[PDB]
Each structure stands twice: as structure tokens, then as C-alpha cells.
Amino acid sequence: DCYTELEKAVIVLVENFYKYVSKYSLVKNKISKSSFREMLQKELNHMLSDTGNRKAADKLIQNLDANHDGRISFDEYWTLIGGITGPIAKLIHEQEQQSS
């Protein structure tokens, strides 16, 4: 009984990123491309059923900024979760209205 529901959800977003960093990674604030694709596939595969959906995801992965190291920071993973989740948000909230 303290934390708020939004605050619980930021926490899940934040625990969910760090679950994808491999144990004994010398970069332990960053996840790999292939570990990301693996999260999308496993953690979002309801929200990513459509095939327009699924596809527009991987271009964001593939469109990404080339870097010194090629891994994904937390700020980027957040920005990517948000390109997925943003064109659908109005549909996500519509669907919530449907039932309770």
C-alpha cells in the first residue's frame, strides 16, 4: 500500500529493460539489438499481433543510430517502446473503455 499505479508501471518498464541486459555484461546499463527483438517478441506479442504493428517495430530497431558500441541505452529503449506505443494509444484507450 504505498506506490501508485503509474509509479508501479514505471517500475515494471524499468525492471523489464534491465531483465534484458545479460549477466556478466561489461555494459550493464545497455541491452543488445538481438536481446531487444527477443523482448518485443516475448513481452509485447499481444500488442504486436497486427503485422503492420510488428513490421513498424523492426524498422525502428533497424532505423536506429549507429554507435561506438552498437548497444541500446535506456533512453533509447524508452523512445522505442514509445514509437510502438504511440501510433496506437488511442486504440489502446478505446479498448480499455470496451469492458471495465
Next chain:
Amino acid sequence: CYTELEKAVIVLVENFYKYVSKYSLVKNKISKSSFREMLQKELNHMLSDTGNRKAADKLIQNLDANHDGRISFDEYWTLIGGITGPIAKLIHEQEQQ
């Protein structure tokens, strides 16, 4: 049901539309004052510190000049992440202890 990561994306979406006022003629949008009411009511354990708050305050001052003065879903997602990015590690090591 949905994975715990899905049900938290959903909770970021119901939370932003909870702060669209009832009968507003714009939605896809909250005003900046309702976003601060959100920060003060929904995020008050994570924004306890005056230091965070003045960082979050200034994110809201650097949003782009609006044809509306209001916040899209896109802007709000990028402000919740501007609040969450710098303390992310801290959230992670907290849940660990």
C-alpha cells in the same frame, strides 16, 4: 492475459487520458497544468525530491511552442521518460535491496 510489460504500457495510456478533462474539445491532449497535477498526484513518491522536480519542471519549459499550448501523447511519453531516464538505475538498485 497480457504480460506485465503490456499491462504497464496500458497503465501509461490510461493515466494520460485520465488527465484529459471531461468535455475537452481536444483529445490526444492534456494541458501543462494537468500534467503538473499528474506529476504531483500520480508520481509523488518518485518526484519527492525538490532536485528531480526542478529537472522535470524544466523539461516542461523546453517542450516546443504549441499551436495549442497542450501536451500530445508523444510529448507526454517523452516527459515521463525524461523523468525516468536519470533515476532509472536508482529504481533498479531500489527494487533489488
